[PDB]
Structure 1
């Protein structure tokens, strides 16, 4: 199936006045690993989007959303919020109901007005996972579910959230042949965003 040709994973988690989102770096073609630097996480203003699945669609969706959000900012005269972007992603996906993009997007961000952390996931045709502890996606989503349900607890400080989402991603990835090969982690607060590249197994 198309959603397991290139491989890769995304996970997002909420913490106290923070959210985090993470992904691996792999792009392969079946068993052949090809790119060691294929990030799966993008941002439009202060809203983050991670995307797993077919790499060509990952790239396409990014461009589509940069396009849509840029127009939004121009017309609305303010940058899009995570809640609103979430609906936009959903309807964009559903528009292709019968010829869908083979993706599993994930949204993370902090609403500029409430200061409230927000995450969501989607199936390939736009169904929204409204859950607000963690969201997982990709070829190691089973592993991720297991890691998150285990390691997660609510209202982690950013420094602690960083360890949690890191260990969830790293350990899930090492049990998946199609994921891994590097990772990036974003810790997102109101006034600061920190990106980090994790050290992991290279097999």
Structure 2
């Protein structure tokens, strides 16, 4: 397949007045690992992040071309961006290539910078958004992560438990996908602090 040429895995999960996002740290060609500190989560503001799994060329291209538009936006505008609007910006950016598509399936997670209610979204490679209220996944291990988040997720979760949930899903999912792993990184973002952790994961 196409997106399995580089691999990847991204997850997002909400709490009560908080949200999380996680990704694996591997870069490799078809079956060979090249690098173990590859970036797949990109900040798009304070209390707002985006994650990208797919073809690495398209990951970097989409991130750079989106930061372009975001910087011009918040310069013309006098305000930081809402997540609902970043979702539509990405949808437009991807649907402009409806027949030349970027091979990415982004995942967004953030807090509105006035009322700080959490937000999580998912998009396809041509920009159909998907605003769930429990969790979203994208990558090569999507079924394996659906199976974990369906069983472990609970409605109201403080950050100490949300971290455990989004970590125990990612670890046990990427431990059954051959082209995803070699580390897992997690971001927890609240009104007052953004916490960031790398986890003890298998490197096989």
Instruction: State the TM bucket, normalised to the shorter chain.
Output: over 0.9
TM-score, reference length from structure 1 = 0.98
Residues 45-89 of structure 1 show CA distances to partners (whole Å, capped at 9, x for unaligned) of 122100000001001111011111111110111111111101111
8 A contact 1:39–1:184 mirrored in 2: no
1:27-176 equivalence runs, <5 A: 27-46=27-46, 47-176=48-177
Cα deviation per residue 1:112-144 (whole Å; 9 max; x = unaligned)?
122110000001100111112100010111101
1:18 partnered with 2:18: yes
Higher strand residue share? 1
For the aligned residues, what is the CA RMSD? Answer: 0.8
Identify the residue that residue 8 of structure 1 maps to in structure 2: 8
Unaligned runs of 5+ in 2: none
Q: Deviations over 1:127-171 (max 9, x none)?
A: 111112100010111101111101111110011100000001011
Q: Please give the secondary structure, in 1, of the residue aligned with 2:80.
A: coil
CA contact (8 A) 2:25 2:36 kept: yes
Which runs of at least 4 in structure 1 moved beyond 6 Å after TM superposition? none
Secondary structure (helix, strand or coil) at the match of 1:129 reads coil
| SS of structure 1 residue aligned to 2:187 | strand
Unaligned runs of 5+ in 1: none
| Structure 1 position 39, deviation (Å) | 2.2
Q: TM-score w.r.t. structure 2 length? A: 0.98
> How far off its partner does 1:91 sit?
1.1
